[PDB]
Tab-separated table of C-alpha atoms and ligand atoms in Angstrom:
chain	number	residue	atom	x	y	z
A	12	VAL	CA	113.233	94.692	111.722
A	13	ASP	CA	110.345	92.594	112.792
A	14	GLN	CA	110.505	88.808	113.149
A	15	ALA	CA	107.848	88.136	110.476
A	16	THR	CA	110.054	89.822	107.875
A	17	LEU	CA	113.024	87.702	109.042
A	18	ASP	CA	111.015	84.568	108.557
A	19	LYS	CA	110.344	85.642	104.875
A	20	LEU	CA	113.942	86.598	104.408
A	21	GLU	CA	115.361	83.351	105.816
A	22	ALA	CA	113.061	81.243	103.598
A	23	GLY	CA	114.028	83.392	100.530
A	24	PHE	CA	117.753	82.880	101.124
A	25	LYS	CA	117.191	79.066	101.246
A	26	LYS	CA	114.948	79.124	98.133
A	27	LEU	CA	117.755	80.951	96.160
A	28	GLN	CA	120.463	78.670	97.374
A	29	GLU	CA	118.187	75.710	96.354
A	30	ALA	CA	117.317	77.154	92.914
A	31	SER	CA	119.750	75.130	90.900
A	32	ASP	CA	118.630	76.705	87.540
A	33	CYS	CA	118.452	80.294	88.645
A	34	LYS	CA	120.982	82.438	86.904
A	35	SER	CA	120.290	85.951	88.368
A	36	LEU	CA	122.950	88.085	90.038
A	37	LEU	CA	120.981	88.213	93.396
A	38	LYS	CA	121.613	84.392	93.703
A	39	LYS	CA	125.234	84.650	92.625
A	40	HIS	CA	126.319	87.457	94.964
A	41	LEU	CA	123.888	87.056	98.142
A	42	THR	CA	126.372	84.882	100.233
A	43	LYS	CA	125.465	83.755	103.704
A	44	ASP	CA	127.866	86.336	105.129
A	45	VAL	CA	126.429	89.027	102.998
A	46	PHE	CA	122.896	87.987	103.871
A	47	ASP	CA	123.620	87.827	107.507
A	48	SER	CA	125.691	91.044	107.561
A	49	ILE	CA	122.819	93.361	106.320
A	50	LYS	CA	119.466	91.520	106.957
A	51	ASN	CA	118.881	93.277	110.309
A	52	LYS	CA	119.458	96.852	108.784
A	53	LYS	CA	116.918	99.465	108.140
A	54	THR	CA	116.843	102.776	106.422
A	55	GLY	CA	115.137	106.097	107.715
A	56	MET	CA	112.089	105.299	105.690
A	57	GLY	CA	112.059	101.696	106.999
A	58	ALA	CA	113.166	99.874	103.926
A	59	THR	CA	114.614	96.303	104.694
A	60	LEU	CA	116.387	93.568	102.686
A	61	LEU	CA	113.097	91.979	101.864
A	62	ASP	CA	112.009	95.193	100.033
A	63	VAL	CA	115.283	95.069	98.158
A	64	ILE	CA	115.426	91.273	97.173
A	65	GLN	CA	111.764	90.332	97.054
A	66	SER	CA	111.336	90.765	93.346
A	67	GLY	CA	114.403	88.498	92.777
A	68	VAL	CA	113.141	85.791	95.206
A	69	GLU	CA	109.686	85.515	93.704
A	70	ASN	CA	111.002	85.802	90.011
A	71	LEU	CA	113.840	83.409	89.892
A	72	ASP	CA	114.153	84.185	86.063
A	73	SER	CA	115.240	87.651	86.920
A	74	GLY	CA	118.598	88.698	85.486
A	75	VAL	CA	119.444	90.931	88.421
A	76	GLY	CA	116.797	90.619	91.130
A	77	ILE	CA	117.048	93.784	93.193
A	78	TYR	CA	115.884	97.357	93.503
A	79	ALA	CA	116.658	100.333	95.823
A	80	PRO	CA	113.552	101.413	97.706
A	81	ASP	CA	115.278	104.626	98.718
A	82	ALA	CA	118.688	106.245	97.899
A	83	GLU	CA	119.978	105.025	101.336
A	84	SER	CA	119.431	101.380	100.496
A	85	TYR	CA	122.369	101.454	97.954
A	86	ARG	CA	124.622	101.878	100.994
A	87	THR	CA	122.715	100.355	103.877
A	88	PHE	CA	122.722	97.108	101.808
A	89	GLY	CA	126.068	97.829	100.118
A	90	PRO	CA	127.389	94.533	100.455
A	91	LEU	CA	124.744	93.147	98.118
A	92	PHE	CA	124.486	96.114	95.816
A	93	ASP	CA	128.155	96.683	95.343
A	94	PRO	CA	129.284	93.294	94.028
A	95	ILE	CA	126.073	93.114	91.807
A	96	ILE	CA	126.698	96.644	90.480
A	97	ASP	CA	130.438	95.770	89.752
A	98	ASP	CA	129.282	92.635	87.992
A	99	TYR	CA	126.565	94.115	85.846
A	100	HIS	CA	128.437	97.099	84.556
A	101	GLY	CA	131.505	95.188	83.495
A	102	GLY	CA	133.941	96.520	86.226
A	103	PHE	CA	133.219	99.098	88.927
A	104	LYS	CA	135.184	98.706	92.218
A	105	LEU	CA	134.146	99.773	95.703
A	106	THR	CA	136.585	102.624	95.423
A	107	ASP	CA	135.430	103.765	92.054
A	108	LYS	CA	133.455	106.894	91.207
A	109	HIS	CA	131.235	107.443	88.199
A	110	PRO	CA	132.657	110.142	85.830
A	111	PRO	CA	131.016	113.679	85.388
A	112	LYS	CA	128.200	114.163	82.805
A	113	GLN	CA	129.675	114.395	79.166
A	114	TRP	CA	127.499	114.074	75.998
A	115	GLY	CA	130.616	114.301	73.865
A	116	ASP	CA	131.059	115.416	70.382
A	117	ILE	CA	127.806	114.518	68.691
A	118	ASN	CA	129.102	115.266	65.251
A	119	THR	CA	131.209	112.192	65.346
A	120	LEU	CA	128.226	109.886	65.326
A	121	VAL	CA	127.123	108.225	61.959
A	122	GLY	CA	124.277	106.659	60.264
A	123	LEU	CA	124.137	103.111	61.528
A	124	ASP	CA	122.622	101.370	58.465
A	125	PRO	CA	122.583	103.568	55.216
A	126	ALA	CA	121.118	100.986	52.920
A	127	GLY	CA	118.250	100.541	55.301
A	128	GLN	CA	118.109	96.690	55.135
A	129	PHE	CA	118.814	95.840	58.871
A	130	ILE	CA	117.695	98.721	61.190
A	131	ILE	CA	114.071	99.468	61.788
A	132	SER	CA	114.224	102.209	64.403
A	133	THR	CA	116.590	103.877	66.883
A	134	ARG	CA	116.043	104.949	70.442
A	135	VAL	CA	117.870	106.569	73.352
A	136	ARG	CA	116.521	106.979	76.781
A	137	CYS	CA	117.702	108.390	80.175
A	138	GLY	CA	116.123	108.169	83.539
A	139	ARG	CA	115.981	110.696	86.408
A	140	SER	CA	114.761	110.859	89.903
A	141	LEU	CA	113.227	114.040	91.560
A	142	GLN	CA	115.098	115.398	94.633
A	143	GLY	CA	113.065	114.980	97.865
A	144	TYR	CA	111.190	111.935	96.552
A	145	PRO	CA	112.082	108.273	97.282
A	146	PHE	CA	111.680	105.555	94.842
A	147	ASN	CA	108.464	103.769	93.953
A	148	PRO	CA	108.131	101.521	97.022
A	149	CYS	CA	108.343	104.404	99.467
A	150	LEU	CA	105.945	106.823	97.585
A	151	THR	CA	102.404	107.632	98.889
A	152	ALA	CA	99.440	108.086	96.465
A	153	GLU	CA	99.512	111.777	97.136
A	154	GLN	CA	103.170	111.968	96.178
A	155	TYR	CA	102.492	110.283	92.784
A	156	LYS	CA	100.025	113.000	92.200
A	157	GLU	CA	102.354	115.856	93.434
A	158	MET	CA	105.167	114.561	91.094
A	159	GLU	CA	102.879	114.195	88.161
A	160	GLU	CA	101.773	117.895	88.610
A	161	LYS	CA	105.481	119.114	88.843
A	162	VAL	CA	106.627	117.237	85.795
A	163	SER	CA	103.584	117.854	83.620
A	164	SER	CA	103.625	121.618	84.309
A	165	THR	CA	107.403	121.725	83.619
A	166	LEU	CA	106.978	120.036	80.222
A	167	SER	CA	104.225	122.545	79.236
A	168	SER	CA	107.061	125.001	78.783
A	169	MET	CA	108.827	123.001	76.083
A	170	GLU	CA	109.104	124.713	72.829
A	171	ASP	CA	109.709	123.978	69.080
A	172	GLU	CA	110.512	120.390	68.221
A	173	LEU	CA	110.002	119.441	71.874
A	174	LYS	CA	106.667	121.261	72.493
A	175	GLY	CA	103.930	118.658	73.401
A	176	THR	CA	101.035	117.511	75.442
A	177	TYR	CA	100.651	115.447	78.793
A	178	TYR	CA	98.416	112.482	78.722
A	179	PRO	CA	97.514	110.858	82.062
A	180	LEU	CA	96.861	107.225	82.138
A	181	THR	CA	93.839	108.098	84.210
A	182	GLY	CA	91.212	108.921	81.547
A	183	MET	CA	93.198	107.454	78.849
A	184	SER	CA	91.075	105.144	76.717
A	185	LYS	CA	91.929	101.461	76.705
A	186	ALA	CA	92.230	101.449	72.844
A	187	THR	CA	94.565	104.397	72.943
A	188	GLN	CA	96.752	102.862	75.608
A	189	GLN	CA	97.150	99.532	73.966
A	190	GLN	CA	98.067	101.089	70.577
A	191	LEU	CA	100.737	103.302	72.322
A	192	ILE	CA	102.202	100.227	73.856
A	193	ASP	CA	101.935	98.021	70.799
A	194	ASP	CA	103.739	100.909	68.719
A	195	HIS	CA	106.540	100.892	71.299
A	196	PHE	CA	105.897	104.461	72.745
A	197	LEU	CA	104.186	103.862	76.038
A	198	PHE	CA	105.466	101.709	78.858
A	199	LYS	CA	103.581	98.534	79.470
A	200	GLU	CA	100.920	97.989	82.305
A	201	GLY	CA	101.487	95.076	84.668
A	202	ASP	CA	105.227	93.972	84.915
A	203	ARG	CA	105.749	91.046	87.273
A	204	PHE	CA	109.322	92.096	88.285
A	205	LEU	CA	108.228	95.707	89.141
A	206	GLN	CA	104.980	94.460	90.706
A	207	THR	CA	106.621	92.203	93.209
A	208	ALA	CA	109.082	95.053	94.116
A	209	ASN	CA	105.906	97.006	95.050
A	210	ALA	CA	106.796	99.660	92.434
A	211	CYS	CA	103.224	99.858	90.978
A	212	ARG	CA	101.092	100.643	93.928
A	213	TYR	CA	98.046	102.986	93.297
A	214	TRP	CA	98.273	102.317	89.690
A	215	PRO	CA	97.457	104.204	87.483
A	216	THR	CA	97.445	107.212	89.846
A	217	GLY	CA	100.063	109.796	88.944
A	218	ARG	CA	101.255	107.895	85.764
A	219	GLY	CA	101.197	109.114	82.272
A	220	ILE	CA	103.153	110.116	79.173
A	221	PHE	CA	104.211	113.188	77.586
A	222	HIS	CA	105.130	113.582	73.939
A	223	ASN	CA	105.346	115.843	70.927
A	224	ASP	CA	102.760	115.287	68.156
A	225	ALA	CA	105.350	113.349	65.904
A	226	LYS	CA	106.160	111.149	68.972
A	227	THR	CA	109.856	111.419	68.492
A	228	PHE	CA	110.280	112.939	71.897
A	229	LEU	CA	108.541	111.351	74.825
A	230	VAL	CA	108.669	111.362	78.643
A	231	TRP	CA	107.226	108.559	80.895
A	232	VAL	CA	105.994	109.847	84.254
A	233	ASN	CA	106.054	107.432	87.291
A	234	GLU	CA	106.724	104.059	85.761
A	235	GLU	CA	109.946	102.436	86.891
A	236	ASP	CA	111.668	105.797	87.495
A	237	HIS	CA	110.120	109.180	88.078
A	238	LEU	CA	111.074	110.184	84.670
A	239	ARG	CA	112.234	108.419	81.563
A	240	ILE	CA	113.235	110.824	78.885
A	241	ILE	CA	112.924	109.411	75.468
A	242	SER	CA	113.976	110.236	71.935
A	243	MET	CA	113.201	107.936	69.047
A	244	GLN	CA	112.383	107.632	65.408
A	245	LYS	CA	112.442	105.225	62.374
A	246	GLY	CA	115.632	104.530	60.665
A	247	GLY	CA	119.264	104.706	61.783
A	248	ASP	CA	119.961	108.384	62.162
A	249	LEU	CA	121.640	108.047	65.686
A	250	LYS	CA	123.190	111.471	65.454
A	251	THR	CA	119.767	113.228	65.116
A	252	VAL	CA	118.083	110.922	67.799
A	253	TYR	CA	120.977	111.669	70.221
A	254	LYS	CA	121.090	115.307	69.580
A	255	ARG	CA	117.286	115.623	70.329
A	256	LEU	CA	117.631	113.783	73.682
A	257	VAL	CA	120.612	116.010	74.661
A	258	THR	CA	118.656	119.206	73.842
A	259	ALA	CA	115.726	117.867	75.875
A	260	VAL	CA	117.627	116.738	78.913
A	261	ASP	CA	119.721	120.010	79.121
A	262	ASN	CA	116.518	122.078	78.983
A	263	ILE	CA	114.658	120.054	81.436
A	264	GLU	CA	117.702	119.745	83.881
A	265	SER	CA	117.721	123.548	84.198
A	266	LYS	CA	114.088	123.419	85.439
A	267	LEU	CA	113.773	120.282	87.668
A	268	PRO	CA	116.143	119.323	90.412
A	269	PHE	CA	117.305	115.714	89.879
A	270	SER	CA	119.093	113.399	92.292
A	271	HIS	CA	122.792	112.991	91.584
A	272	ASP	CA	125.354	110.968	93.584
A	273	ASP	CA	129.085	111.604	93.838
A	274	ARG	CA	129.736	107.827	93.351
A	275	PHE	CA	126.791	106.529	91.421
A	276	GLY	CA	125.974	109.463	89.147
A	277	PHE	CA	122.281	109.953	88.502
A	278	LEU	CA	120.190	107.827	90.822
A	279	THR	CA	117.613	105.328	89.613
A	280	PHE	CA	115.306	102.664	91.038
A	281	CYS	CA	117.272	99.756	89.366
A	282	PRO	CA	121.126	99.433	89.912
A	283	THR	CA	121.389	98.718	86.311
A	284	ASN	CA	120.323	102.156	85.427
A	285	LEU	CA	122.813	104.236	87.475
A	286	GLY	CA	125.315	106.660	86.204
A	287	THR	CA	124.548	107.876	82.716
A	288	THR	CA	121.205	106.029	82.928
A	289	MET	CA	121.374	105.718	79.222
A	290	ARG	CA	120.078	102.889	77.105
A	291	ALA	CA	120.601	103.434	73.336
A	292	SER	CA	119.109	100.725	71.286
A	293	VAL	CA	118.074	99.661	67.842
A	294	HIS	CA	115.271	97.415	66.547
A	295	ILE	CA	117.200	95.435	64.123
A	296	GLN	CA	116.970	92.337	61.910
A	297	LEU	CA	120.073	90.021	61.474
A	298	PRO	CA	118.607	86.733	60.192
A	299	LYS	CA	121.995	85.023	59.497
A	300	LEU	CA	123.537	85.902	62.861
A	301	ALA	CA	120.292	85.344	64.776
A	302	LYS	CA	119.762	81.742	63.639
A	303	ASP	CA	119.832	81.023	67.435
A	304	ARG	CA	119.231	83.779	69.760
A	305	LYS	CA	121.568	82.245	71.992
A	306	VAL	CA	124.368	82.633	69.395
A	307	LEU	CA	123.250	86.153	68.794
A	308	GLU	CA	123.507	86.937	72.523
A	309	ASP	CA	127.072	85.481	72.707
A	310	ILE	CA	128.249	87.715	69.836
A	311	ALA	CA	126.537	90.836	71.328
A	312	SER	CA	128.051	90.286	74.815
A	313	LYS	CA	131.527	90.605	73.371
A	314	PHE	CA	130.637	94.066	72.120
A	315	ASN	CA	129.195	94.796	75.677
A	316	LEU	CA	125.551	94.879	74.166
A	317	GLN	CA	122.399	93.233	75.461
A	318	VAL	CA	119.666	91.531	73.527
A	319	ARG	CA	115.999	92.006	74.377
A	320	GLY	CA	112.762	90.909	72.677
A	321	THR	CA	110.593	93.223	70.466
A	322	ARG	CA	108.209	94.322	73.219
A	323	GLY	CA	111.098	94.869	75.584
A	324	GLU	CA	113.107	92.910	78.196
A	325	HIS	CA	111.662	89.444	79.143
A	326	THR	CA	109.854	89.207	75.755
A	327	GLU	CA	110.544	87.058	72.712
A	328	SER	CA	111.681	88.377	69.386
A	329	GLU	CA	108.857	88.696	66.811
A	330	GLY	CA	109.417	88.393	63.043
A	331	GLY	CA	113.067	88.310	63.603
A	332	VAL	CA	113.081	91.724	65.209
A	333	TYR	CA	115.570	92.178	68.117
A	334	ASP	CA	116.219	95.031	70.605
A	335	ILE	CA	120.092	95.522	70.919
A	336	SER	CA	121.453	98.044	73.105
A	337	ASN	CA	124.616	99.029	75.306
A	338	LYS	CA	124.431	97.029	78.608
A	339	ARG	CA	126.653	99.225	80.674
A	340	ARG	CA	125.424	102.638	82.168
A	341	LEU	CA	127.669	103.266	84.979
A	342	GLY	CA	131.461	103.998	85.059
A	343	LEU	CA	131.388	105.388	81.611
A	344	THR	CA	130.291	108.687	80.134
A	345	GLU	CA	127.115	109.322	78.043
A	346	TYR	CA	129.268	109.591	75.043
A	347	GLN	CA	131.053	106.393	75.788
A	348	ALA	CA	127.830	104.599	76.348
A	349	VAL	CA	126.183	105.677	73.055
A	350	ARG	CA	129.459	104.829	71.178
A	351	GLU	CA	129.395	101.354	72.442
A	352	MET	CA	126.093	100.759	70.895
A	353	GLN	CA	127.118	102.479	67.596
A	354	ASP	CA	130.403	100.726	67.363
A	355	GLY	CA	128.927	97.262	68.216
A	356	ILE	CA	125.998	97.628	65.808
A	357	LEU	CA	128.034	98.715	62.860
A	358	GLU	CA	130.335	95.647	63.295
A	359	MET	CA	127.513	93.177	63.896
A	360	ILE	CA	126.051	94.518	60.540
A	361	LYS	CA	129.429	93.977	58.911
A	362	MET	CA	129.407	90.402	60.225
A	363	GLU	CA	125.952	89.827	58.915
A	364	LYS	CA	126.889	90.987	55.542
A	365	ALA	CA	130.000	88.647	55.523
A	366	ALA	CA	128.094	85.682	56.864
A	367	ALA	CA	127.138	82.776	54.717
B	125	ADP	N1	115.114	100.830	69.178
B	125	ADP	C1	113.727	100.768	69.611
B	125	ADP	N2	112.827	101.164	68.674
B	125	ADP	C2	111.474	101.203	68.965
B	125	ADP	N3	110.888	100.855	70.131
B	125	ADP	C3	111.919	100.480	71.036
B	125	ADP	C4	113.172	100.369	70.873
B	125	ADP	N4	114.002	99.948	71.922
B	125	ADP	C5	113.074	99.808	72.937
B	125	ADP	N5	111.792	100.001	72.369
B	125	ADP	C6	110.480	99.818	73.171
B	125	ADP	O1	110.630	100.484	74.369
B	125	ADP	C7	109.581	99.939	75.300
B	125	ADP	C8	110.361	99.709	76.644
B	125	ADP	O2	110.837	98.557	76.759
B	125	ADP	P1	112.174	98.060	77.960
B	125	ADP	O3	112.633	96.806	77.360
B	125	ADP	O4	111.261	98.127	79.151
B	125	ADP	O5	113.036	99.298	77.712
B	125	ADP	P2	113.346	100.729	78.922
B	125	ADP	O6	112.741	100.515	80.128
B	125	ADP	O7	114.929	100.720	79.086
B	125	ADP	O8	112.854	101.612	77.909
B	125	ADP	C9	109.125	98.712	74.600
B	125	ADP	O9	107.889	98.860	74.076
B	125	ADP	C10	110.102	98.376	73.475
B	125	ADP	O10	109.581	97.865	72.438
B	126	ORN	N1	115.788	96.731	84.592
B	126	ORN	C1	116.159	95.437	84.308
B	126	ORN	C2	116.003	94.566	85.504
B	126	ORN	C3	114.664	93.729	85.395
B	126	ORN	C4	114.482	92.623	86.474
B	126	ORN	N2	114.540	93.313	87.860
B	126	ORN	C5	115.543	91.638	86.295
B	126	ORN	O1	116.442	91.515	87.144
B	126	ORN	O2	115.427	90.862	85.256
B	127	MG	MG1	111.212	99.313	81.087
């Protein structure tokens, strides 16, 4: 670890300590002992603590503030990752291990809002990393291209409901890209948290989106994770949405080798996405309960749910439409994760109906 990087690290620790109004987990859990204990360590690919924490240092409004440049980073820098992971996922000790993959009994899921007055649309995503490839900050341009080839070729073999077309961002018209983002299908371009983590190098090389013609099944290639596998549609039919995701993941898993860890389950670039990697969300209106997004957030948290804006995390609600989803992804099964969203959303709707 070179002196120049230490200089940047030493200054960052100071800034975080000084940042009286910063509320991120990096600031909360990076003690001097923790800082000093791991700041001189390096992975086989050369990732340092600066690579891990830089996004959180520059963006003090981060909720978390760290990413893993490679798989080893999760352990090399364990003293920072471990307490943050334990904190975010609502309890996960050093000695704990994520449970085996388990979709559960899909037929037990219900319609989240039959009368149709609150929920606009429902979405479930997972993430996966390809074996033999490190996370974004350690990839070369050529590797982005190799991965894109592997994934796009694999998805050409999808059949029936899942059959579709791959659209590279390279060559995609600006008008088409903006509509796909505005309609909540395609990942946004230019995220400051990812950018400062050096996760977006060589953009847009190797990046793109696969989807079926109806756009109920989508796959993001080379954004935050190597793959994000997405099922979504209008309405509240979670059972159908979830079933389509399961079908897709089971079929894709048989074809492509994904990184899985005995302790952390499926590996991802952000520690919030470990384990099941699953984020099940609704776009929902709750005008009475949301009369102050800070009140909404306090209610949601007790149901282990997270509130995001209409265009995703770090955005505002528009027209009263909030994104509400399970917060926890690690230390519970896929079934348990999706049920927390279902259970929480059904009750919040009950509360909305009962509210004055
Ligand atoms: N329930 C939903 N219905 C429609 N679009 C959604 C829903 N939940 C999230 N989205 C969209 O997904 C995109 C990604 O947003 P982010 O907040 O980055 O989620 P993740 O990275 O976990 O998908 C954004 O355009 C957001 O609008
Ligand atoms: N994936 C959610 C984390 C986004 C950003 N690193 C933050 O800490 O807010
Ligand atoms: Mg995202």
